[PDB]
CSV table of C-alpha atoms and ligand atoms in Angstrom, one decimal:
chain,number,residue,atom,x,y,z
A,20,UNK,CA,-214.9,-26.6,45.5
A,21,UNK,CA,-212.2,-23.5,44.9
A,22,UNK,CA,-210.8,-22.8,42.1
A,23,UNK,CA,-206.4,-23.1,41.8
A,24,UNK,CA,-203.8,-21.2,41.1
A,25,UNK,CA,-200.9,-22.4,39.1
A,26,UNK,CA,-197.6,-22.2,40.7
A,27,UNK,CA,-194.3,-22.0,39.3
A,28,UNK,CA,-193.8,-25.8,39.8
A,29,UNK,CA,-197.2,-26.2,37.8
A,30,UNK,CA,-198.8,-27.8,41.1
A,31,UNK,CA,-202.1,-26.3,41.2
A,32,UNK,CA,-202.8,-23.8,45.2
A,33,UNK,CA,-206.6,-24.1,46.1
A,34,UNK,CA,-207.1,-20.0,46.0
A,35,UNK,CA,-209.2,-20.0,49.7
A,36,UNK,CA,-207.7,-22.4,52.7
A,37,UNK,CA,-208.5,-22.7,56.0
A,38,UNK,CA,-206.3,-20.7,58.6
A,39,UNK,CA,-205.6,-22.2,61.7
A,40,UNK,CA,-203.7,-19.7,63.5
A,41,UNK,CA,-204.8,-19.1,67.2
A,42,UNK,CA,-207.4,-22.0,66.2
A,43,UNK,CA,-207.7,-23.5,69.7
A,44,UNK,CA,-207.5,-27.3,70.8
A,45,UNK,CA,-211.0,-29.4,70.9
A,46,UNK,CA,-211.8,-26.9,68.2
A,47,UNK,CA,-209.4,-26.9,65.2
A,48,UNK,CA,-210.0,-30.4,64.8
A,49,UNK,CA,-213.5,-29.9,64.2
A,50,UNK,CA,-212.4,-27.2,62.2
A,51,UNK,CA,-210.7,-29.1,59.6
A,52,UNK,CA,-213.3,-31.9,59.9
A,53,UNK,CA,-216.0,-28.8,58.7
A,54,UNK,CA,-213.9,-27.6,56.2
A,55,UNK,CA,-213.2,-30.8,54.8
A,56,UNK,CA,-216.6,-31.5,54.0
A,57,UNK,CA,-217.0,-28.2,52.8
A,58,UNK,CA,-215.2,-28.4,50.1
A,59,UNK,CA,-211.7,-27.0,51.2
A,60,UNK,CA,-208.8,-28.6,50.2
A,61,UNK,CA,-205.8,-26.0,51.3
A,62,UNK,CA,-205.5,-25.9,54.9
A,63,UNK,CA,-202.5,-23.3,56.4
A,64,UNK,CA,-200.6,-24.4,59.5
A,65,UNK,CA,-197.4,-23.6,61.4
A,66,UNK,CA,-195.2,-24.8,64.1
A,67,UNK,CA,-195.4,-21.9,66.0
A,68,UNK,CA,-199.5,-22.1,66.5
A,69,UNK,CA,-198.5,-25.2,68.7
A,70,UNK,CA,-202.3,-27.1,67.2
A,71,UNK,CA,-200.8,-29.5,64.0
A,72,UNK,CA,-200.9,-32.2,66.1
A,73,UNK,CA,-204.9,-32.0,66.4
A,74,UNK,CA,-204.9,-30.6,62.4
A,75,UNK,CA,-202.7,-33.7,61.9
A,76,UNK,CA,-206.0,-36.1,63.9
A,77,UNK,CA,-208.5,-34.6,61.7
A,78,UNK,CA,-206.5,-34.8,58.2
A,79,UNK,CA,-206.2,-38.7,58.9
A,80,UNK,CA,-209.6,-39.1,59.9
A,81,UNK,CA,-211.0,-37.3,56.3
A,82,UNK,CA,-208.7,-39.6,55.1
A,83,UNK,CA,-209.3,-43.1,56.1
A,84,UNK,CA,-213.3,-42.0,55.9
A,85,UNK,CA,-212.8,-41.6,52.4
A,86,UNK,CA,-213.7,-38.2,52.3
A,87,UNK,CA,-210.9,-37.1,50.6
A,88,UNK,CA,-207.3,-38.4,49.2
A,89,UNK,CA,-203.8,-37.2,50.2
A,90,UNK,CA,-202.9,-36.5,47.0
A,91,UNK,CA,-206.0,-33.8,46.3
A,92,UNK,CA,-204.9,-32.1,49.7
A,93,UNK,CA,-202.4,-29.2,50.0
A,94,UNK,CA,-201.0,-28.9,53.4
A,95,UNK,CA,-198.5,-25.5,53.7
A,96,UNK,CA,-197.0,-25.1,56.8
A,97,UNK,CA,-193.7,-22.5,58.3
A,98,UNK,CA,-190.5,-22.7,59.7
A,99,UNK,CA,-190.2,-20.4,62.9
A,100,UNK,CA,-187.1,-18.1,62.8
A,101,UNK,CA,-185.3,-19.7,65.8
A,102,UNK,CA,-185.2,-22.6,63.8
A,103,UNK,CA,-182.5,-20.9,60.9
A,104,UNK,CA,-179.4,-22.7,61.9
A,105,UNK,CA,-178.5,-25.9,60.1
A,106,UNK,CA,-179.6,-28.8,62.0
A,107,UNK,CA,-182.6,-27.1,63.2
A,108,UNK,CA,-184.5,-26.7,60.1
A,109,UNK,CA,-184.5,-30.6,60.2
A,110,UNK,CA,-186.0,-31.2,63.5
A,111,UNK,CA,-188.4,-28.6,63.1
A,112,UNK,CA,-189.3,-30.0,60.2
A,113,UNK,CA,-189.8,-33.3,61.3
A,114,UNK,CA,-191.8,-32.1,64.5
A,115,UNK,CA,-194.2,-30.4,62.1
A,116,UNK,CA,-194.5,-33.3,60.2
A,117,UNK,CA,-195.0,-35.2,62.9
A,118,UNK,CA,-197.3,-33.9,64.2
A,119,UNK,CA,-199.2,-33.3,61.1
A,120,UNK,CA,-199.4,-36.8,60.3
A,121,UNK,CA,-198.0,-36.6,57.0
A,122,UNK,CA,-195.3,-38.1,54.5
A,123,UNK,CA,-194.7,-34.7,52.8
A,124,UNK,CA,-196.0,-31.1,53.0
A,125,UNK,CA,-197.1,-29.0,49.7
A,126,UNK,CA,-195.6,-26.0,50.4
A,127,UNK,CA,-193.3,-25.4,53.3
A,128,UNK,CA,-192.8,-21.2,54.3
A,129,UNK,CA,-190.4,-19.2,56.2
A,130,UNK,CA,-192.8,-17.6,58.8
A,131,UNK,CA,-190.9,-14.7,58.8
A,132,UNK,CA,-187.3,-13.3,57.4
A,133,UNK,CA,-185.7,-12.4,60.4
A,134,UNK,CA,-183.6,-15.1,63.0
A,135,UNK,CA,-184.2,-15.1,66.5
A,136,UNK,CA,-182.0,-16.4,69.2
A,137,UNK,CA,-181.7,-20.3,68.2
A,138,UNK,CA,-183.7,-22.7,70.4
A,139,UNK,CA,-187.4,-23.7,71.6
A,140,UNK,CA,-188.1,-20.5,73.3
A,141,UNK,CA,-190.1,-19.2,70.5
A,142,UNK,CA,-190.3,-15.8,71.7
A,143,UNK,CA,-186.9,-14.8,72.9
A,144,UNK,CA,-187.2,-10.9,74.1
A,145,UNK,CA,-185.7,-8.5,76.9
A,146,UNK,CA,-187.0,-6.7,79.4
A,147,UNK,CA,-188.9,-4.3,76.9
A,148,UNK,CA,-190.5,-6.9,75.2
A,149,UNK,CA,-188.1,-6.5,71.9
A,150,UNK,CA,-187.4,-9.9,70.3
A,151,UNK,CA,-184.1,-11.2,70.4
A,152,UNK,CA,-182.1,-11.8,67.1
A,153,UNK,CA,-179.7,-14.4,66.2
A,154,UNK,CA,-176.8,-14.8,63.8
A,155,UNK,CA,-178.6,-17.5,61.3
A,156,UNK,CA,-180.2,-15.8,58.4
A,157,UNK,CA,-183.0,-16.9,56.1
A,158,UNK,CA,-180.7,-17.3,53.5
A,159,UNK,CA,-179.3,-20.2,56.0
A,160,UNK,CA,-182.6,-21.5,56.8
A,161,UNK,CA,-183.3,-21.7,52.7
A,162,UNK,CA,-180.2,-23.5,51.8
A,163,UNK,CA,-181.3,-26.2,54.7
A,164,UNK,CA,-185.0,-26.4,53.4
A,165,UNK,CA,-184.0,-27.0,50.2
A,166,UNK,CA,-182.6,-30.3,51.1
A,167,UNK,CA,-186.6,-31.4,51.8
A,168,UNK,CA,-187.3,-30.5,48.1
A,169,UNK,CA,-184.3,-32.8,47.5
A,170,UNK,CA,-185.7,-35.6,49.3
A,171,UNK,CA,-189.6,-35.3,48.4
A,172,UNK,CA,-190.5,-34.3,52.0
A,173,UNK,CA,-191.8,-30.4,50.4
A,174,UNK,CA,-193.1,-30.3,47.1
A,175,UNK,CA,-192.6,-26.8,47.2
A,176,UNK,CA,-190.9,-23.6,49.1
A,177,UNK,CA,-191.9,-20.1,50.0
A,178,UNK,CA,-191.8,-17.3,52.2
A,179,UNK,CA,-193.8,-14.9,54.4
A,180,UNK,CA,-193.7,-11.5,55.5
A,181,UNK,CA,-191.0,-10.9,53.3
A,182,UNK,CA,-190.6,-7.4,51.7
A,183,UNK,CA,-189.4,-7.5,47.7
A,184,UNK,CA,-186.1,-6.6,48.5
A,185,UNK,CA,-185.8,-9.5,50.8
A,186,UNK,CA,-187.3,-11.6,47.8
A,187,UNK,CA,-184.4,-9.7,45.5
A,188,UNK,CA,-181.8,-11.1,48.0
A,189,UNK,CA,-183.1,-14.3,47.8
A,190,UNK,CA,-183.5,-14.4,44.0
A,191,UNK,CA,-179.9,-12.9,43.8
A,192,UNK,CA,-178.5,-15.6,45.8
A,193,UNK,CA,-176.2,-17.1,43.6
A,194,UNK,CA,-176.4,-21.2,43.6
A,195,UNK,CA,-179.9,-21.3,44.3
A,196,UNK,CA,-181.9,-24.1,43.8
A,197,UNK,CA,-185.3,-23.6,44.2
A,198,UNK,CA,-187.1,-20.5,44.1
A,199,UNK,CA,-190.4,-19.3,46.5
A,200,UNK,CA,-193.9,-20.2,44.8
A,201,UNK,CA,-195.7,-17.5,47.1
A,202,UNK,CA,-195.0,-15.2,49.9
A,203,UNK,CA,-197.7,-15.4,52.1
A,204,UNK,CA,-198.3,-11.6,53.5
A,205,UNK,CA,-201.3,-9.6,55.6
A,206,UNK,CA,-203.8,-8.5,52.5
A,207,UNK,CA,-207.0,-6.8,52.7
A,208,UNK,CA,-208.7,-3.3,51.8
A,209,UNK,CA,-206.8,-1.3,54.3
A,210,UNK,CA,-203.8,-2.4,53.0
A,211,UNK,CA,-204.3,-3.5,49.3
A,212,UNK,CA,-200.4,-4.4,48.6
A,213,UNK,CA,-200.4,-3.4,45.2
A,214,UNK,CA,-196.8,-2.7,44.5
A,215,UNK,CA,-195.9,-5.9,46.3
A,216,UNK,CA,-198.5,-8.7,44.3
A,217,UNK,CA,-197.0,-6.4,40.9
A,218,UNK,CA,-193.7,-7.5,42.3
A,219,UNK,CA,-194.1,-10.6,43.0
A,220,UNK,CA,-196.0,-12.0,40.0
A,221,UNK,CA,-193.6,-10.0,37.7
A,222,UNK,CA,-191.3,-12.8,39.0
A,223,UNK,CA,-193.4,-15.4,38.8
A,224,UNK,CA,-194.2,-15.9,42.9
A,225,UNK,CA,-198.3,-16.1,43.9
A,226,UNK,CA,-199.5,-14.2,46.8
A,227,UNK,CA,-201.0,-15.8,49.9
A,228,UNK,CA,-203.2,-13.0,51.7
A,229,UNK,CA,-203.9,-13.9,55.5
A,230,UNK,CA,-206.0,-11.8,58.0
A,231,UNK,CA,-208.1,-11.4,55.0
A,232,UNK,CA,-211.0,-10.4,57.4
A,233,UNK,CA,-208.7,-7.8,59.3
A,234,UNK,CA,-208.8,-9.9,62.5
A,235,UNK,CA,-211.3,-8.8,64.6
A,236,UNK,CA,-210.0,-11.2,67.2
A,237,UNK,CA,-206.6,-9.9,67.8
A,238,UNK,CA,-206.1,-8.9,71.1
A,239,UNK,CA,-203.7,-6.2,70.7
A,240,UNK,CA,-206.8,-4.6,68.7
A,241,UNK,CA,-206.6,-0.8,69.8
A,242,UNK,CA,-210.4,0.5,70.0
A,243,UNK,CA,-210.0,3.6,67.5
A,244,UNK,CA,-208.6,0.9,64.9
A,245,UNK,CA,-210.5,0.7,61.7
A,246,UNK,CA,-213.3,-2.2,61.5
A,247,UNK,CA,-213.2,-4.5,57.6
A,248,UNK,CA,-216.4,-6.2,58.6
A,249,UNK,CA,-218.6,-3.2,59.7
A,250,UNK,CA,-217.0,-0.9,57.2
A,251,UNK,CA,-220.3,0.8,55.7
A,252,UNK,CA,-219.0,1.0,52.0
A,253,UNK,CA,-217.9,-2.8,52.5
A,254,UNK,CA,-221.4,-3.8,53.7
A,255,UNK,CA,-223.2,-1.7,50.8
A,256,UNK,CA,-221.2,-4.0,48.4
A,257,UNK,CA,-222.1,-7.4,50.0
A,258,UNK,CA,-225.3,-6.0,50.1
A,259,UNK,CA,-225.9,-5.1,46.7
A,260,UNK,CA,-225.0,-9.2,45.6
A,261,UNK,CA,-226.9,-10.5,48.9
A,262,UNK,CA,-223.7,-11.8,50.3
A,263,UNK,CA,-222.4,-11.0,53.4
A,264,UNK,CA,-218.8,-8.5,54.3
A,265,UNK,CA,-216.9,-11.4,54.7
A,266,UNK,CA,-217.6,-13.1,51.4
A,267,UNK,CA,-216.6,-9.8,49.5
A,268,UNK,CA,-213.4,-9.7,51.7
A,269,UNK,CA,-212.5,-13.2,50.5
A,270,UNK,CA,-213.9,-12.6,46.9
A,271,UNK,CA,-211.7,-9.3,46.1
A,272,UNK,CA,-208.6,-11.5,46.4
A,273,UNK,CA,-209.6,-14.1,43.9
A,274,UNK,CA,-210.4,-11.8,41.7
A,275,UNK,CA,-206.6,-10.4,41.6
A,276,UNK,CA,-205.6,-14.3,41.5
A,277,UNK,CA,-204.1,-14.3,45.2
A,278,UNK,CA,-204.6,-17.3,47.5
A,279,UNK,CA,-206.4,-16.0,50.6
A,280,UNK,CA,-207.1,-18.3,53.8
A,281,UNK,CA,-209.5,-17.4,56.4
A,282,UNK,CA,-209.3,-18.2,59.5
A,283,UNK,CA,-212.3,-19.6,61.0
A,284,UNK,CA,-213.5,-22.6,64.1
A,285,UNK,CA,-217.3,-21.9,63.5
A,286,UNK,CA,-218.6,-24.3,61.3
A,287,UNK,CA,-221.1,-22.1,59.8
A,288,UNK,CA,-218.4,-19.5,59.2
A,289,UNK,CA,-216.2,-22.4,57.7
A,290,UNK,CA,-219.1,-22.9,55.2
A,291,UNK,CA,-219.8,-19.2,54.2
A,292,UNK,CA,-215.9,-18.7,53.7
A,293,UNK,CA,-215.9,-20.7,50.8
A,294,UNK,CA,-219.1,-19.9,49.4
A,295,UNK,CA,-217.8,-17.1,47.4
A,296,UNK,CA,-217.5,-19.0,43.5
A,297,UNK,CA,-221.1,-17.8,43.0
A,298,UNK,CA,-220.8,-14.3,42.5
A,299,UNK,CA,-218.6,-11.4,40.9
A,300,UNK,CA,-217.2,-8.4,42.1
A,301,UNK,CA,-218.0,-6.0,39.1
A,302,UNK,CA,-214.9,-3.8,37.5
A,303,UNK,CA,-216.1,-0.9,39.9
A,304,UNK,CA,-216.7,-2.4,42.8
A,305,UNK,CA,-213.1,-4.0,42.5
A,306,UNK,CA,-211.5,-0.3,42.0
A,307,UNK,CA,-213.9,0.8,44.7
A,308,UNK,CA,-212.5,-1.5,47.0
A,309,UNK,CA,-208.8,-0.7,45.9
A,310,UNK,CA,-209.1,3.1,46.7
A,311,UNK,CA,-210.0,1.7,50.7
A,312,UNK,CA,-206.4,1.1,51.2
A,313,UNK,CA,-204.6,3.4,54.7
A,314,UNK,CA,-201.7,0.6,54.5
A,315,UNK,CA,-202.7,-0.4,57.6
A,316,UNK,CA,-201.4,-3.5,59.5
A,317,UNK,CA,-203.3,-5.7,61.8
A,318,UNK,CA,-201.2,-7.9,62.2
A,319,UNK,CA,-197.2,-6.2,63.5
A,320,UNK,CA,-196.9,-7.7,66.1
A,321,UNK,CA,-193.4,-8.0,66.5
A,322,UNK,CA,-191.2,-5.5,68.1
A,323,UNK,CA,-188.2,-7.1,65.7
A,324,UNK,CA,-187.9,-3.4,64.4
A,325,UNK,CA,-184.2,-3.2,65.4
A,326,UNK,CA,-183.0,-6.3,64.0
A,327,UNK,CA,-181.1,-6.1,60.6
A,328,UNK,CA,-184.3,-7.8,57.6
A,329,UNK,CA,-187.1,-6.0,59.1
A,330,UNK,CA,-190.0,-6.2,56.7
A,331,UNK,CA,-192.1,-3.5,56.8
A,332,UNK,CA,-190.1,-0.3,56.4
A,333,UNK,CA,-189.8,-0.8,53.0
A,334,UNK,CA,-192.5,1.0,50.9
A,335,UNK,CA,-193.2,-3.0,49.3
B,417,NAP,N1,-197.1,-14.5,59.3
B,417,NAP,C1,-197.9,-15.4,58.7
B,417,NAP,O1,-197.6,-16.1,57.7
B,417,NAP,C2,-199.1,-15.6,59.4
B,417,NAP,C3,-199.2,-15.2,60.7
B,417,NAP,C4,-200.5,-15.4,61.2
B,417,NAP,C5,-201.5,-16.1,60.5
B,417,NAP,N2,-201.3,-16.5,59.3
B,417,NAP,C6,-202.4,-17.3,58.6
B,417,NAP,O2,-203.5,-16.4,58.1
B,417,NAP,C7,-204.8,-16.9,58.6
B,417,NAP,C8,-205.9,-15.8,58.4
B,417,NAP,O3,-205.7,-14.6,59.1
B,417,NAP,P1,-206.1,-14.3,60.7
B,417,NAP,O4,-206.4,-15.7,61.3
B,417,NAP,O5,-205.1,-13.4,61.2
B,417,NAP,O6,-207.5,-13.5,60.7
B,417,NAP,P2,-208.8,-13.4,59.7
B,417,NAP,O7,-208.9,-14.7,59.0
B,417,NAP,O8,-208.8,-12.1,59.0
B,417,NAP,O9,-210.0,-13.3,60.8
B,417,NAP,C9,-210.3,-14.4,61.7
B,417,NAP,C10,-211.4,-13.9,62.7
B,417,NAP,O10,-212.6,-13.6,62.0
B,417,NAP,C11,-213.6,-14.4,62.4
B,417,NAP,N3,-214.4,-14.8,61.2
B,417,NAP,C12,-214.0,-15.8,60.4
B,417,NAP,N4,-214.9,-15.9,59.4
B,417,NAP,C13,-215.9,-15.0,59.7
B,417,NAP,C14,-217.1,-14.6,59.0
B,417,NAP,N5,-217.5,-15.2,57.9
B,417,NAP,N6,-217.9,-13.6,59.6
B,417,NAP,C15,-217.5,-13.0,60.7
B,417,NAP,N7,-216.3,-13.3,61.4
B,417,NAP,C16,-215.5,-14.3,60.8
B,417,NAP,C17,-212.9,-15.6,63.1
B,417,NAP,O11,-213.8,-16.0,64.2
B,417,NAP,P3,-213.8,-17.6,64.6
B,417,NAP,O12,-212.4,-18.2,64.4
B,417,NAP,O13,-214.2,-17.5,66.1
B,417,NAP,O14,-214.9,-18.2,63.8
B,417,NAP,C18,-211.7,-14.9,63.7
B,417,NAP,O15,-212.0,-14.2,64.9
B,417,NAP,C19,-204.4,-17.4,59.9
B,417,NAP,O16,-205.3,-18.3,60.5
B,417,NAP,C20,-203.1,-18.1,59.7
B,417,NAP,O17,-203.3,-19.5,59.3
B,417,NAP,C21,-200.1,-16.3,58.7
């Protein structure tokens, strides 16, 4: 069973969740049936994965089973950025929870700080391949998500991929309501964030690290790029505790109290993922792990680089 992490709200984050991103159908309901069982209890979704529908099947099934009780689950999921004007944050919204199955959602993120072209084509690009912008903001998208705090449909909001200063200009938006209780960013030892998770707990926002494992799936991976799970000074580590790469992957973020969900459809995976309350991570081995950082992203994937609140130009 994880341990929490307080938010500003006081609502207690499970610190490891199960991703379910690229998490394909007739597996990702298994998934969450494993994990379930396993002890997890936070469990990371978004529209634009196009799978809460089957996350939604196996939350209810836990459910009526007995296995587990709404109230001790904490669902997150995102708002896609052609969803940022008005009336579309609402029936996003409501397709997510939908699908999901769900009265309310814990924690409800914007995926990303940039608007696309409004609409249901969720990747509207050019020739080149360049995404598309459009004239809502995330500011715009806030205001409108806000309104499910209002109404008890989100317990809580946040944000993802956002850079600090587009947390500042968020913060600084005068008339604010609510404020973001994480931003949910790509965290690992290649790319150890530390100027960012200084940031953002300086004001009182958690950290939710995804790709935690470097995602050796991605298909974009280029051959010559650098490998978490096989990295020799990674494996001496797991080694010396018995545990295995992943584990100390998952370990070194709950050690620097940031949320970190895995992403995993094989049940014995699931299981190991979370098997990681049973061991420490000594003082060195931490600052060992720390000095592995090349700030290198796995996960840029899109060519949004032109459009006005690009991310990840920003030193944090
Ligand atoms: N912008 C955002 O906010 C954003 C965007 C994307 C994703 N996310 C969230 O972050 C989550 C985690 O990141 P990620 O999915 O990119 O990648 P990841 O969790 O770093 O890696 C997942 C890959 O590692 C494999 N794996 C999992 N556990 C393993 C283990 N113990 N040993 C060896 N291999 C293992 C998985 O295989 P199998 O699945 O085949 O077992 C999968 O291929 C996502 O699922 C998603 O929910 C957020």
């Amino acid at each position: 069973m994880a341990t929490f992490v307080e938010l500003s709200t006081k609502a207690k984050m499970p610190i490891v969740g199960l991703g379910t991103w690229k998490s394909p159908l007739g597996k990702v309901k298994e998934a969450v049936k494993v994990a379930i069982d396993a002890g997890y209890r936070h469990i990371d979704c978004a529209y634009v994965y196009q799978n809460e529908h089957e996350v939604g099947e196996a939350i209810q099934e836990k459910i009526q089973e007995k296995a587990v009780k709404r109230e001790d689950l904490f669902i997150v999921s995102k708002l896609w950025p052609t969803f940022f004007e008005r009336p579309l944050v609402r029936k996003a919204f409501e397709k997510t929870l939908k699908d999901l199955k769900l009265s309310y959602l814990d924690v409800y993120l914007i995926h990303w700080p940039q608007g696309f072209k409004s609409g249901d084509d969720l990747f509207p690009r050019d020739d080149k391949g360049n995404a598309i912008g459009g004239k809502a903001t995330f500011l715009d998208a806030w205001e409108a998500m806000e309104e499910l705090v209002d109404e008890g449909l989100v317990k809580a909001l946040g944000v993802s991929n956002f850079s600090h200063f587009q947390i500042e200009k968020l913060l600084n938006k005068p008339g604010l309501k609510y404020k973001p209780v994480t931003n949910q960013v790509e965290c690992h030892p290649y790319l150890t964030q530390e100027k960012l998770i200084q940031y953002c707990h300086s004001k009182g926002i958690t950290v939710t690290a995804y790709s935690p494992l470097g995602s050796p799936d991605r298909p974009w991976a280029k051959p010559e790029d650098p490998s978490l799970l096989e990295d020799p000074k990674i494996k001496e580590i797991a080694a010396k505790h018995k545990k295995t790469a992943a584990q100390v992957l998952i370990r070194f973020h709950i050690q620097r109290n940031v949320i970190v969900i895995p992403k995993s459809v094989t049940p014995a995976r699931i299981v190991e993922n979370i098997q990681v309350f049973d061991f420490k991570l000594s003082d060195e081995e931490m600052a060992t792990i720390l000095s592995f950082n090349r700030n290198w992203r796995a996960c840029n994937l899109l060519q949004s680089s032109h459009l006005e609140d690009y991310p990840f130009n920003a030193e944090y």
